[PDB]
Structures are given as structure tokens and as C-alpha cells.
């Protein structure tokens, strides 16, 4: 294997090979106190859904 390589400045937007991150976790309202998700449930909403 004999290879030469050219690296140029880039961003994740143009390729995941320049991606600075794999995934970024973003959260808020850790109890759904703002009512942004339904807590879909078969029996009950608070207990079916974890903390």
C-alpha cells in the first residue's frame, strides 16, 4: 500500500468524515412539566415512563 493524501478544511455539513461529533445529546424539562410530550401509555402515563 503506497498512498499520498491531501486533507483540506471541512465541516460535517459537507461530509461526515469532517464531522466534529458523532451525536450531541440535547434535553430539557426532565419531568415533562412543560408538556412537550404526551407520555403515550397503555395503563398510566407517569409510571410507564421513566425518570
Amino acid at each position: 500500500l503506497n498512498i499520498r493524501c491531501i486533507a483540506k478544511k471541512g465541516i460535517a455539513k459537507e461530509h461526515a468524515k469532517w464531522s466534529p461529533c458523532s451525536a450531541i445529546a440535547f434535553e430539557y424539562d426532565p419531568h415533562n412539566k412543560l408538556k412537550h410530550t404526551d407520555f403515550w401509555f397503555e395503563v398510566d402515563a407517569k409510571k410507564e415512563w421513566p425518570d
Binding site: 461526515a16 468524515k17 464531522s19 461529533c21 458523532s22 451525536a23
Partner: protein
Amino acid sequence: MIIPVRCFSCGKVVGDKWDAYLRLLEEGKQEGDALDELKLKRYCCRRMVLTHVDLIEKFLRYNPLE
């Protein structure tokens, strides 16, 4: 064949773990704890290593032209 350089679902540096993964395998070790040892936290990264199929060993055991 050949584990991806970057994790398809996530994008984590994963390539430099295969030999380490085999090392962990050799000692009759469970799979999941070994993957956790490999810093495989996201189950996407986890099954990417768990379910990767490398195939070059049969290809390489062919005697090449040179």
C-alpha cells in the same frame, strides 16, 4: 469485511478496536461486557462491532498473483 472507520449510525472512532475486541474474545469472555470495555456505549456502536462481518481472511488466504 473491515469494520467501518466511522460509526454509521453515530460516527464514533471505532476502527482501532477490532484487534482489542479479539483479545477480549480470546479469554472465553461474554460479549456485552467486552463491548462496554471497548467504550461501546451507544447500542448502535455496540451492534456495529457485535455484528460486523470481516471477510478478508478468506480473501487473503488465496495465494495472490504477487
